Amino acid sequence: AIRKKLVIVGDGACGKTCLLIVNSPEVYVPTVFENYVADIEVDGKQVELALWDTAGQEDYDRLRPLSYPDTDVILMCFSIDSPDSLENIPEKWTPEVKHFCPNVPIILVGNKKDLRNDEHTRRELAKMKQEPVKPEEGRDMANRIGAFGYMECSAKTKDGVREVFEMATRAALQ
């Protein structure tokens, strides 16, 4: 068997847990999610991808790094409806990941892509002089932080989700 560990990293509000859930329910959406192994096939290779959530660890800087050892790929997450969550990637999360996970492959993921053209979303952001994150911004940031690649998804419509974890698996197999 090929076994790889994924750790998802990012702001608490960016929907990290929802993303892991929708790779694993019209009948209920769980608030919390424990470690789970997904079976993913890329390029004729079967990989057991262990998914580690970091939700709830944002405010405990001493406890949080225990999630990092033996990581094969970091899923760096932000939400497209939150430019602030994107700025926290170079400001907070990338330095932390580079420190605790040196030479570990990173993929950059923009979640909640369905909210990009959401009128309610755009007016809420407009009040704060902001707009939803553009795809080019994600590609540029992926370059800046040395990510394997950037792609977007919606845990709501499940669009892009499968491809995200397939890209993560490819990065892990590097």
Partner: protein, 336 residues
């Protein structure tokens, strides 16, 4: 939920509140089963098969599953607060009384780092690795590794504020649980902060005990007195030597790692720099031949002058170190 009578027909919001209450309960049940499994599937066979010693296993597993009755206690109280209905009216008072007892996990969580060190040490042991492979191949593990099971308490503990806030989200303004859940949130935030800090203290003491001093002048009481290790890890010096740096709140200690029977020790290099006397200088790429992602630390060089040009792995790695050191220095002068 699906357990509940179809006649029971309330708002979407209360169903959510009951779903949230129930999700917490299901998480407790899963918790209990996995803690029992960790002891029975990993610890006990390795003990019986002489794959690891009793002392080694005790160091790794400790009191991992010792607080099963704590979680059973919670399920009992939720059960008795449940109606023939399936519905739960009030849970705030239960949580307010129960959550402080999660204090029990302080010791286990603070030893987790040391347990991981021993496990990593056992990566050289073929018998250990083969047994761990065997477990991964069997259904009981759900393809999760031992470390995942060992991390169960830390992983669960940080979930409680999220579970509590979700319950509060669907709790009506008028309900007495509004005030009770708010107190319960402050309570769990308090116990998590304390577990967070003690883990930090243990990690701090862990490396402090591994410090080696060739000269007595290198010793500094502010090191031993440290309770918080802000940042630690390796950086390259100008000479090319890979140094291991420890940034405690009040003092920065540079070291050279030494074999001591695959017990790493950290040979103190030059004098430890009190954050009180610490100067941080940002250098540009190419300023120094080692040439990217470099910075300099030095004494306020009124003191006898020692300075170190250090190189991080990349621009954002440099930022982790630079920000930590800069914040430490600023923290001092904020309190003098």
């Amino acid at each position: 939920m699906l357990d509940i009578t179809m006649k029971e027909s309330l708002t979407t919001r209360e169903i959510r509140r009951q779903e949230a209450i129930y999700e917490m309960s299901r998480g407790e049940q899963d918790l209990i089963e996995d803690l029992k499994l960790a002891r029975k599937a990993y610890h006990d066979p390795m003990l019986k098969l002489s794959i690891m010693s009793e002392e080694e296993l005790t160091h790794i597993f400790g009191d991992l599953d010792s607080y099963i009755p704590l979680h059973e206690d919670l399920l009992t109280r939720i059960g008795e607060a449940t109606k023939p209905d399936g519905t739960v009216e009030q849970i705030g008072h239960i949580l307010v009384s129960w959550l402080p007892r999660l204090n029990a996990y302080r010791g286990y969580c603070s030893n987790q780092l040391a347990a991981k060190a021993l496990l990593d040490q056992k990566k050289q042991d073929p018998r250990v690795q083969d047994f761990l492979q065997r477990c991964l191949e069997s259904p009981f593990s759900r393809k999760l590794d031992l470390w995942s099971f060992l991390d169960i308490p830390r992983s669960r503990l940080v979930k409680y504020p999220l579970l509590l806030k979700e319950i509060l989200k669907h709790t009506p303004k008028e309900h007495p649980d509004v005030q009770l859940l708010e107190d319960a949130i402050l309570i769990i935030q308090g116990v998590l902060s304390d577990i967070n800090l003690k883990k930090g203290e243990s990690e701090c003491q862990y490396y402090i005990d591994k410090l080696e001093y060739l000269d007595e002048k290198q010793r500094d009481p502010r090191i031993e007195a440290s309770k918080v290790l802000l940042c630690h890890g390796e950086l390259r010096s100008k000479s090319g030597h890979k140094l291991y740096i420890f940034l405690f709140q009040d003092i920065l200690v540079l070291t050279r790692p030494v074999t001591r029977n695959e017990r790493h020790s950290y040979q103190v290099y030059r004098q430890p720099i009190p954050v009180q006397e610490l100067v941080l200088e940002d250098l540009q790429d190419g300023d120094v031949r080692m040439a990217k992602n470099i910075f300099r630390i030095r004494f306020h060089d009124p003191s006898p002058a020692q300075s170190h040009t250090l190189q991080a792995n990349d621009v954002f790695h440099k930022q982790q170190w630079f920000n930590c050191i800069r914040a430490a220095i600023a923290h001092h002068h904020h309190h003098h």
